[PDB]
């Protein structure tokens, strides 16, 4: 029953760029994202890993903290976190009860002379549940760009840019410069210590823009490679050992929980924000066991062994790449199948094309959200790529992942053929892999 309730929210957000009708509403709301300081991340790729990051080690500073991220992977209730854990889902439900009346009030008003969108609703939820719990500081990981983002109403203290690349597809040829600009929007003019921007690898027509607008605020860089950096990485049972140059000092025998040279990049660019937040040294053995108590649920997530299955949200080609080099190089698998399913705004190419010097074969699917690309469409893709031989379609998550496991099968009984299986494409296949293996949202 808290559960029909909150089934009942998400049905009506469901049937839901200017700032106007965010700021109407926070100043309805008493303006509660300016009663507590922010780290807001933009970028195309990491937001969510370097959020929970930044959340982890501000945790091992003993400081409250509250978390927006998005999107979900298996519940709406993991878009709002305090103390490192999603609220429930009374709180959710409770939280929209309690801001809807003033919500009403800003899509009638609006309509009298555009309804509020589901994630304005969504922020606005986050950031009064933030003052009712009450944090130290939050994390807020923006929606989409930044300029324009539900999330840029609070002038964070602390701006951090992951790096930027291709993901939502509207035309062929790139703009670099333009989504770069929408982005850096996050960089404001404090009111009070100067904005410091946290930059992580860019190419640099990016790092040029970013640069611009740094400037615009005033606000003080600290770019990754010149600020701040990756040392030393070695992979580890479970993840990783790093060895990282943060503002403050270098910081060694740092273990990570994570797979993946993109994560080492991750946490250091966490690391130098939570350094740009508290001024930084920072002690190291709370570095240490922040770092050690980062979870990412989805991100190269390790389901099972024998055979091993990992769920990945990739769902752009920096993303498949840096998922193909991980599997490739930091384990030694002799088999792999990859289960797919991808939305149709995402460069589908691009990331078929990272993937297949990787997966022995690939079965398609459908992830079962109406944003999601045909499986027949998504076959021939593959086909163009893979070969039509070493592709497979199933009609659904649970039948792909089932075709999946005897080609593993098949493979394992195979002797001149350390097998697995990979499901990704997409945030919604990863989190819909997940309810599957019967995990709890995190
Ligand atoms: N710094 C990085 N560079 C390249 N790929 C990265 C990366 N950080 C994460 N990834 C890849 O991107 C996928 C999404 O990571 P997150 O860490 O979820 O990115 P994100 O928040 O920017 C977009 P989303 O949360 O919509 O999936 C990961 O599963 C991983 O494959
Ligand atoms: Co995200
Ligand atoms: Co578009
Ligand atoms: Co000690
Ligand atoms: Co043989």
Same mark, same amino acid.
């Given at each position: 029953?808290?559960?029909?309730?909150?089934?009942?929210?998400?049905?009506?957000?469901?049937?839901?760029?200017?700032?106007?009708?965010?700021?109407?509403?926070?100043?309805?709301?008493?303006?509660?994202?300016?009663?507590?300081?922010?780290?807001?991340?933009?970028?195309?790729?990491?937001?969510?890993?370097?959020?929970?990051?930044?959340?982890?080690?501000?945790?091992?500073?003993?400081?409250?903290?509250?978390?927006?991220?998005?999107?979900?992977?298996?519940?709406?209730?993991?878009?709002?976190?305090?103390?490192?854990?999603?609220?429930?889902?009374?709180?959710?439900?409770?939280?929209?009860?309690?801001?809807?009346?003033?919500?009403?009030?800003?899509?009638?008003?609006?309509?009298?002379?555009?309804?509020?969108?589901?994630?304005?609703?969504?922020?606005?939820?986050?950031?009064?549940?933030?003052?009712?719990?009450?944090?130290?500081?939050?994390?807020?990981?923006?929606?989409?760009?930044?300029?324009?983002?539900?999330?840029?109403?609070?002038?964070? $203290?602390?701006?951090?840019?992951?790096?930027?690349?291709?993901?939502?597809?509207?035309?062929? /040829?790139?703009?670099?410069?333009?989504?770069?600009?929408?982005?850096? /929007?996050?960089?404001?003019?404090?009111?009070?210590?100067?904005?410091?921007?946290?930059?992580?690898?860019?190419?640099?027509?990016?790092?040029?823009?970013?640069?611009?607008?740094?400037?615009?605020?005033?606000?003080?860089?600290?770019?990754?490679?010149?600020?701040?950096?990756?040392?030393?990485?070695?992979?580890?049972?479970?993840?990783?050992?790093?060895?990282?140059?943060?503002?403050?000092?270098?910081?060694?025998?740092?273990?990570?929980?994570?797979?993946?040279?993109?994560?080492?990049?991750?946490?250091?660019?966490?690391?130098?924000?939570?350094?740009?937040?508290?001024?930084?040294?920072?002690?190291?053995?709370?570095?240490?066991?922040?770092?050690?108590?980062?979870?990412?649920?989805?991100?190269?997530?390790?389901?099972?062994?024998?055979?091993?299955?990992?769920?990945?949200?990739?769902?752009?080609?920096?993303?498949?790449?840096?998922?193909?080099?991980?599997?490739?190089?930091?384990?030694?698998?002799?088999?792999?199948?990859?289960?797919?399913?991808?939305?149709?705004?995402?460069?589908?190419?691009?990331?078929?094309?990272?993937?297949?010097?990787?997966?022995?074969?690939?079965?398609?699917?459908?992830?079962?959200? $109406?944003?999601?690309?045909?499986?027949?469409?998504?076959?021939?893709?593959? /086909?163009?790529?893979?070969?039509?031989?070493?592709?497979?379609?199933?009609?659904?998550?649970?039948?792909?992942?089932?075709?999946?496991?005897?080609?593993?099968?098949?493979?394992?009984?195979?002797?001149?053929?350390?097998?697995?299986?990979?499901?990704?494409?997409?945030?919604?296949?990863?989190?819909?892999?997940?309810?599957?293996?019967?995990?709890?949202?995190?």
């Amino acid at each position: 029953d808290e559960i029909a309730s909150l089934l009942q929210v998400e049905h009506l957000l469901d049937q839901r760029p200017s700032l106007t009708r965010i700021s109407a509403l926070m100043d309805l709301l008493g303006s509660p994202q300016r009663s507590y300081p922010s780290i807001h991340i933009a970028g195309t790729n990491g937001k969510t890993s370097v959020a929970r990051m930044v959340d982890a080690l501000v945790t091992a500073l003993h400081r409250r903290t509250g978390r927006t991220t998005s999107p979900h992977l298996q519940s709406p209730v993991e878009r709002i976190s305090i103390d490192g854990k999603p609220i429930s889902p009374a709180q959710y439900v409770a939280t929209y009860r309690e801001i809807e009346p003033l919500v009403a009030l800003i899509d009638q008003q609006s309509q009298a002379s555009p309804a509020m969108s589901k994630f304005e609703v969504l922020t606005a939820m986050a950031f009064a549940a933030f003052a009712d719990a009450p944090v130290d500081v939050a994390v807020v990981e923006v929606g989409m760009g930044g300029r324009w983002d539900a999330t840029n109403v609070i002038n964070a $203290p602390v701006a951090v840019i992951t790096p930027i690349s291709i993901d939502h597809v509207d035309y062929l /040829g790139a703009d670099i410069a333009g989504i770069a600009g929408e982005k850096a /929007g996050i960089i404001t003019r404090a009111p009070s210590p100067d904005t410091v921007a946290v930059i992580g690898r860019q190419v640099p027509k990016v790092m040029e823009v970013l640069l611009a607008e740094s400037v615009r605020a005033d606000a003080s860089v600290a770019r990754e490679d010149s600020e701040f950096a990756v040392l030393r990485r070695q992979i580890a049972v479970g993840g990783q050992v790093l060895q990282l140059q943060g503002l403050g000092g270098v910081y060694s025998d740092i273990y990570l929980p994570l797979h993946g040279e993109h994560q080492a990049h991750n946490a250091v660019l966490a690391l130098a924000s939570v350094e740009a937040f508290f001024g930084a040294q920072l002690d190291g053995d709370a570095v240490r066991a922040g770092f050690a108590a980062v979870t990412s649920p989805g991100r190269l997530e390790r389901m099972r062994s024998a055979p091993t299955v990992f769920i990945d949200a990739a769902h752009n080609p920096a993303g498949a790449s840096a998922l193909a080099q991980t599997l490739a190089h930091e384990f030694d698998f002799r088999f792999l199948v990859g289960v797919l399913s991808v939305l149709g705004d995402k460069d589908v190419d691009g990331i078929l094309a990272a993937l297949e010097p990787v997966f022995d074969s690939v079965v398609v699917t459908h992830n079962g959200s $109406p944003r999601a690309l045909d499986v027949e469409a998504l076959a021939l893709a593959a /086909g163009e790529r893979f070969g039509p031989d070493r592709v497979r379609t199933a009609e659904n998550l649970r039948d792909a992942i089932d075709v999946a496991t005897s080609l593993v099968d098949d493979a394992a009984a195979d002797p001149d053929v350390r097998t697995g299986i990979v499901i990704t494409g997409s945030v919604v296949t990863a989190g819909a892999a997940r309810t599957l293996f019967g995990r709890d949202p995190q």
